[PDB]
Write a protein that binds this DNA or RNA. Structure first.
Ligand code: SSA
Ligand code: SSA
Lengths: 461, 319
RNA sequence: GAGAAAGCUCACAAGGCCAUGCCCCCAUGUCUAACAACAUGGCUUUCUCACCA
């Protein structure tokens, strides 16, 4: 029914068991209860005492097991050394040998009997403990999405002589986007890009990639298929009744999932590996298709599959460095959107929506005139202590010590939201859509016109 | 298996040929170590020069096709079962090349094996104006294959579950001659791309698959493999995708008729990576970059990466 | 991709694709004072029957 894949991974021995944060806030229960309540994750403060008590019991059982193990090792080494000297029948007859053998047998029986109980305790405690969320930054406002503070807004809504139309209607008029009578082939909420739209998407992805490459980001490509354990480590729910991640049929393949985002793939690539101190900070830019079940009635606002460039980087051990890297990522997002020219406001995300694996999150919403409301297109999340601990990502220092490394993940741009914002923002009464200067060279045309080719005719019964 | 054309010259190497995987691991561009749990089996990760090579090849092919007027297009990743049945691929059989989404979670949802199925779905149950024909559109999307043979060369980059493959789809008029010439043009374009890259290659003709009336397979010489490797497959079809999907085109007279369909594969990143790395392989392991891709890569000569390679601290390691 | 077998795989000497040394798996458990030895399973290799849209 329900079982974590990280505990199963550690049990089989594929990877080292993750180090939880319960010890960090175990000192003061009230501070942790208040922070957890503000985050309002799946776990609640009401159930926290049970988890802390079980963890303490687990520590005591492990200490007892260690003591028994030490005694067994000492008796085995002493008996082996004594047996080597004067290895004759008389030594065997000696009472010391018989007593040591009996003690070894008793210790072995005690340890084997204790092992199952300890394993059950560990499974139950780790299962409940995984739900616990990450630390909340003090400067993060507490409340609902509306409560989120606005850091600043760049640009202004464009003045329009006439009411701008919806992006879907403009696309159908220009035939760039076709969403009619697609239930039989691609299912609901499936979209198609044609003509200028496809070129616009490719130009945006290439422009973002070139901009990031010049800054020194190392390009990376991640496989779409991923196993469930990586998903659990990322913090998403791989399996749930309302789960939104697509899982392939079990009979054909087992434990195969479609990547929710490129960052998940990069994290899997970095799982169970170390990085040299000189390389830090390491920035990797990955572009890949993301399929979300996502379980508006019409339009491109909700789409099952889309292409989004994602920048994920592993920073130094110091928390200050992770924050500085997040700030640099935010600056990059601002430069990209200013160059494109869209009106975007960067608002700090509230504690309630921060999520299980994100310490500090910045949400950038771009004004859409046709839609009439800001749409969130860029999200930056500081995975400093949750993802590294879950996947054991560590950075070795010059001395040779291993220190966990903070991870920051952000989305440079999304083709559906940026396409909708650009179309609605630059739409005109004649129906032509102006092209921003950055994408003009890639597209090669300042504006778009009605398609020359005759649009398709529906012959379906 | 007749050889219609042979182009280029086999490279001469003083030292023994080196496998693409060995060069990639030494260069660190591609890593395939202990990725069973993280990414499944026979997957791959491209970093550094490798990622630039994949993007460069896709962008270069896309720009070349666009210059000739190909209409760029994109297709939905998720496709219905009926579309696959129409294209001649059946998922009912237990061993199938089509990934099947869980039925309980979603109903009749299957990943697109190739981009051709998506483009064919696009033209389903629609009539194209007799003036628009011929219509050539280039779609670029990732293709996932359910089964890759592991009996021979399992630990290789030649066959992979997920690969980036540019696909060119062209609808043509009722005349068979129009379809044949369109296929000829597609073959010329792919041959031109390969010649531009400089890979030695031979194009042959497959006898008689059943759905395709004619077929053309282009194989590129690989030094590491030591044998010719198929890199592209353009295969004509005659009144089969349309007669199965009920795709009809209205002529000037107005009579309903079924148009011919031509589908070709411009290029695949994994095979091209193998050929490019092995053909330009040097004595010190450095890989020369062809001038055509120099602008995209931006590096005249690839060298060992400055960043230190990642070490494995996992339990499954000898101690 | 399917089935089955084995325990190691990478590298350095040396001969005209492999003869020998150099090194000879990670875990959970049954009898053992304990290494080892046999099971289940993972991973790295090898041998088979089959699709490559
Ligand atoms: N139903 C949806 N359909 C298509 N695109 C979406 C959808 N929801 C969000 N997006 C786009 O995808 C972006 C990612 O936002 S997010 O999934 O909630 N967070 C992430 O993906 C993290 N990996 C950030 O690096 C959004 O900012 C938006 O641009
Ligand atoms: N198992 C595979 N793994 C990775 N790439 C493949 C694989 N099989 C074929 N390709 C790539 O796709 C090309 C076409 O081979 S094919 O997929 O079986 N046939 C087709 O794609 C045609 N139906 C339209 O493209 C090959 O030349 C190669 O570039």
């Amino acid at each position: 029914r329900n079982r974590n894949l990280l505990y199963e991974y550690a049990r089989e021995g594929y990877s080292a068991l993750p180090q939880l944060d319960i010890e960090r806030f175990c000192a003061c229960p009230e501070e942790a209860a208040h922070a957890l309540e503000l985050r309002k994750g799946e776990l609640r403060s009401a159930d926290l005492p049970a988890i802390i008590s079980t963890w303490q019991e687990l520590r005591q059982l492990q200490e007892q097991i260690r003591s028994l193990e030490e005694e067994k090792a000492a008796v085995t080494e002493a008996v082996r050394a004594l047996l080597a000297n004067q290895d004759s029948g008389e030594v065997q007859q000696d009472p010391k040998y018989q007593g040591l053998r009996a003690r070894g047998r008793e210790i072995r029986k005690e340890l084997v009997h204790l092992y199952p109980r300890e394993a059950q305790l560990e499974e139950q405690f780790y299962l409940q403990a995984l739900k616990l969320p990450n630390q909340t930054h003090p400067d993060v406002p507490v409340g609902d999405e509306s409560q989120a503070r606005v850091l600043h807004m760049v640009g202004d809504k464009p003045v329009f002589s006439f009411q701008p139309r919806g992006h879907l209607e403009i696309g159908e008029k220009l035939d760039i986007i076709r969403q009619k009578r697609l239930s039989h082939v691609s299912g609901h909420r499936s979209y198609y890009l044609r003509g200028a739209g496809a070129l616009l998407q490719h130009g945006l992805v290439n422009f973002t990639f070139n901009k990031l490459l010049r800054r020194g980001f190392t390009p990376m490509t991640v496989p779409d298929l991923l196993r469930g354990a990586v998903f659990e480590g990322c913090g998403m729910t791989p399996n749930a009744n309302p789960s939104q991640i697509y899982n392939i049929d079990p009979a054909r393949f087992k434990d195969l999932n479609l990547a929710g985002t490129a960052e998940v793939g990069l994290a899997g690539y970095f799982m169970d590996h170390t990085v040299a101190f000189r390389d830090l900070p390491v920035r990797m830019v990955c572009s890949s298709t993301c399929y979300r079940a996502e379980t508006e009635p019409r339009g491109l606002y909700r789409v099952h599959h889309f292409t989004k460039v994602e920048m994920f980087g592993v920073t130094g051990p110091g928390l200050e460095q992770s924050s500085q890297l997040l700030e640099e990522f935010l600056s990059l997002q601002m430069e990209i959107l200013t160059e494109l020219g869209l009106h975007f406001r960067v608002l700090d995300m509230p504690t309630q929506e921060l999520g299980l694996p994100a310490y500090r999150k910045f949400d950038i919403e771009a004004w859409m005139p046709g839609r009439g409301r800001f749409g969130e297109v860029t999200s930056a999340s500081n995975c400093t202590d949750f993802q590294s601990r879950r996947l054991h990502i560590m950075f070795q220092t010059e001395a040779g010590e291993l220190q966990f490394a903070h991870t920051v993940n952000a989305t440079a741009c999304a083709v559906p939201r940026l396409l909708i914002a650009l179309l609605e923002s630059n739409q005109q009464k004649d129906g032509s859509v102006l092209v921003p200067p950055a994408l003009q060279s890639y597209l090669g045309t300042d504006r778009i016109t009605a398609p020359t080719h005759v649009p398709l005719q529906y012959i379906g019964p | 298996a007749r050889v219609l054309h042979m182009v280029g010259d086999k490279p001469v190497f003083s030292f023994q040929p080196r496998g693409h995987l060995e060069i990639g691991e030494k260069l660190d561009i591609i890593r395939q170590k202990r990725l069973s749990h993280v990414s499944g089996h026979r997957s791959y990760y491209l970093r550094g020069a490798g990622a630039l090579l994949q993007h460069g090849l896709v962008n270069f092919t896309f720009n070349k096709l666009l210059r000739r007027g190909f209409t760029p297009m994109t297709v939905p990743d998720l496709l219905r079962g009926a579309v696959f049945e129409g294209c001649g691929m059946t998922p009912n059989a237990n061993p199938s090349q089509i990934y099947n989404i869980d039925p309980a979670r979603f109903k009749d949802l299957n990943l697109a094996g190739t981009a051709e199925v998506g483009l064919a779905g696009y033209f389903m149950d629609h009539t194209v104006a007799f003036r628009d024909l011929p219509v050539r559109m280039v779609c670029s999307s990732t293709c996932y294959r359910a089964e890759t043979n592991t009996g021979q060369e399992p630990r290789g980059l030649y066959r992979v579950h997920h690969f980036t493959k540019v696909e060119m789809f062209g609808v043509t008029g009722p005349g068979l001659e129009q379809s044949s010439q369109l296929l000829e043009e597609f073959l010329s374009l792919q041959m031109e791309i390969l010649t531009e890259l400089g890979l030695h290659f031979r194009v042959l003709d497959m006898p008689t698959g059943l759905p395709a009336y004619r077929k053309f397979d282009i194989e590129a010489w690989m030094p590491g493999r030591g044998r010719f490797g198929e890199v592209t497959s353009a295969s004509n079809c005659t009144d089969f995708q349309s007669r199965r999907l009920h795709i009809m085109f209205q002529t000037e007279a107005g009579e309903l008729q079924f148009a011919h369909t031509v589908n070709a594969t411009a290029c695949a990143v994994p095979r091209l990576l193998i050929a490019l790395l092995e053909s330009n392989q040097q004595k010190d392991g450095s890989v020369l970059v062809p001038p055509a891709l120099q602008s995209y890569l931006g590096t005249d000569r690839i060298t060992a990466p400055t960043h230190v390679p990642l070490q494995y601290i996992g339990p499954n390691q000898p101690r």
